[PDB]
Every structure is written in structure tokens, then in C-alpha cells.
Subunit: 218 residues, 2 copies
């Protein structure tokens, strides 16, 4: 109900990848009930990144998922308190990313605060060499748990040449709402497509749009 | 498949890896009762011992063939023979430690052959694991979901710490049959109660004996 038909965001993401420190800010808007959102991102410190921005792209938004009538919306129900998500991204080439994020709501604005630690990226890998060309459309599996959701996607990062780099994404979503009932969903699936709209100054500025739609699985 | 899994089976295991850049190799021999859900492993750290970390984070990577399945729950694991199955796991500790695991289970001349590669990273130097202040895992429940011909396993584990605390760890496991031709009867959602217990250790944990009880039930 505090999640309006049109909602704006402000995001701050910081971390280390291999040893390289950076800080990013974003502002954006979208239609949480239609499942669309756009983000304007700046690398404000440590830019240009000596690695593909694609490994950060997925860490800038699950409030903006179109849920059919019959699938309860864990994300939208989490307000005003919001929810946290924790992710491990396991790259086939040996790279690992750990992500901690806080989603909150302040004065009608969604506030995202993400911390990121990447380690063991092959210095010769496509990521550290910036030879990546975006993520494939994909589907995330959602499994309920004691006061939370578990998220699984086998993701494919496109490489120069037309190869893919395999990466398992696995996420813990947890409401910060501890009192009052959330209606829990069963298992379902979220088709998500993230597309880069625009980049400049060696990827220190990026515009991206995500379209996400929930569906019945089993 | 289920015919090749006898009421007693032995196993042999190689486990190799790196934790926070420290390299090691472990071998194991053991045996168990797959339909009763009991198994025992005698493990040796044969290279890079004593480990500058708690064996407990490796313990859990040394066996789902040995899970007591009631008649009504199809046993994905026993059905996967003689090809056997692979499992892939992420263990995230609340204190930042992360372990990535790849394992190959195969059957050779009536012996189960385990091969595991382990990659630990971001264990805090001052944390209970790197400080070897752990006292084994709590009994816990794994949720099993079917996923496109494989299974996904989710446990929220608790590693006991010196002084009565716990270090909390999420486990995600992708299990995948190497049986590509032939049909496997897929289970629905179910649960596995699993208790891993250290029986015996010596020589600064370069020799460890552990037993696991694992029993499937409806969810």
C-alpha cells in the first residue's frame, strides 16, 4: 500500500573487487506492479573500474516484480520496514562475489545500500579484462523458508566472441518486518531481463532497465 | 541403480583444496548402511596438515547415497547408479567466510568413489574457524526441491563455538545425476534430518573419524 504505482529509488553501492575499491550511487524510477524500473548509475570513486561493470549491474531490486493475483508478493508486503538480501555469485572461472544489501523506505523513496566483495577473479578472465557484453535473459527460482525466501538462478554473462561465462546466483531475501503476518507464497519463478540502455566515460556512467515477471512453477 | 547399492557399502574419498590460500589434500575410507541412513568415515589430512583452520568446515563435504528414504519418497541418489551424481555447494558463514565445493560421486567395482575440490575465501583471521575454536555442527534439516532433472538442498546450519556460541552458515546444494538416458522417478519437496558427529580425532586433527545419520521425511 506504501508501494505506489510509480516509485523512485536512490542507491549507494560500495565494495572491493580483487583488491580494487570503488563507490557507486544511482537514482531511478519504475512501476512496481508492471515489473519495470530504470537506474542511472555513477562510479563516483575508484573509476574507471579495472573490471566489467556487469558484475555490479545485478546488485543495483525485487520490489519491482509483477506478481499475478494468486502469488503473494513477499517484497511489497515488507514495508514500511523493507527487506535485506544476501547473494553469492559463483563464476565458473573461479571468481566469487559476496553481496549484502538493505532495502528501506524513507519519505516515499526506496533506499538501497549494497556492500560488495569480489575475490579470485582470474587477472586474464573476461571480467578483469572488460570483455563482457551483458547478462542473458533468465529465470530465478524462489523457495520459501522460515521468515524468508531463497533465490536461485543459473546466469550466463555474455563474452566478446559470443561465448558465455557461467555464474550461479544464490540469494537469501529476509523481511525486516518481524510483527504482523506476511502471506507466504509457495515455490514460484521470476523471469528477469536486465538490458544496459547507455554507458559513457569508460563505464563510469551507466543507464540500465530491468523487466521482471513472477509466474507459477509447480 | 538401487540394486547396485547394497545394504552395506564402502567408500573411498579424495578431497583437495585451498582455504584463504592454504593448500591441503585429504584421503578417507569408510562404510555405511544406505537404507538405514548411517555411515562412518576415517579421514587423513595427508598434505598441508595441521590445517590452520577447523576441520569442521571440510567435515560436511566428506554423502547423500546413505539417506533412509521411506518407501513413499523416491530416492534420487540411489537411482543415479551406476553413473552416480555430482553436487555443488555454497556455504556462507555470517562472519563473511564463504566455501565453494564441487564433488563427484561414482561407483567402481562395488565401491563408492568421492572426489571433492574445496575453495574457502574471506575467513576472518581472528574468527573461530581460522582460530580453531569450533565444536562441531548442530543436528539440522535440509529442504529438498526438484529442479530440472536435479535437486536443490537448503540447510541453515549452526557451527558450535568455544564458550557456547554459534557461527551460523547457509548451505545451498545443487545435486545432479550423471544418468542422462533412462528415467529417474523425481521426488516432490521433502526433508532430510541429518546429524554429523565427530567420533575420534588425533595429531592436531590430521586424523578424524565421523559418523552421519540422515533420515528423509515428508514436507
Amino acid at each position: 500500500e506504501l508501494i505506489k504505482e510509480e516509485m523512485p529509488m536512490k542507491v549507494v553501492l560500495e565494495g572491493t573487487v580483487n583488491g580494487h575499491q570503488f563507490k557507486c550511487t544511482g537514482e531511478g524510477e519504475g512501476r512496481p506492479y508492471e515489473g519495470v524500473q530504470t537506474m542511472r548509475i555513477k562510479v563516483i570513486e575508484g573509476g574507471p573500474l579495472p573490471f566489467a561493470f556487469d558484475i555490479l549491474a545485478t546488485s543495483f531490486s525485487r520490489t519491482f516484480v509483477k506478481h499475478p493475483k494468486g502469488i503473494p508478493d513477499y517484497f511489497k508486503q515488507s514495508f514500511p520496514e523493507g527487506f535485506t538480501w544476501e547473494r553469492v555469485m559463483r563464476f565458473e572461472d573461479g571468481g566469487v562475489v559476496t553481496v549484502t544489501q538493505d532495502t528501506s523506505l524513507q519519505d516515499g523513496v526506496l533506499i538501497y545500500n549494497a556492500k560488495v566483495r569480489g575475490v579470485n577473479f582470474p587477472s586474464n578472465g573476461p571480467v578483469m579484462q572488460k570483455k563482457t557484453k551483458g547478462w542473458e535473459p533468465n529465470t530465478e527460482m524462489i523457495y520459501p523458508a522460515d521468515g524468508g525466501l531463497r533465490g536461485y538462478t543459473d546466469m550466463a554473462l555474455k563474452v566478446d566472441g559470443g561465448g558465455h561465462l557461467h555464474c550461479s546466483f544464490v540469494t537469501e531475501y529476509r523481511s525486516k518486518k518481524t510483527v504482523g503476518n506476511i502471506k507466504m507464497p509457495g515455490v514460484y519463478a521470476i523471469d528477469h531481463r536486465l538490458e544496459r540502455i547507455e554507458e559513457s566515460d569508460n563505464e563510469t556512467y551507466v543507464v540500465q532497465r530491468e523487466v521482471a515477471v513472477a509466474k507459477y512453477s509447480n
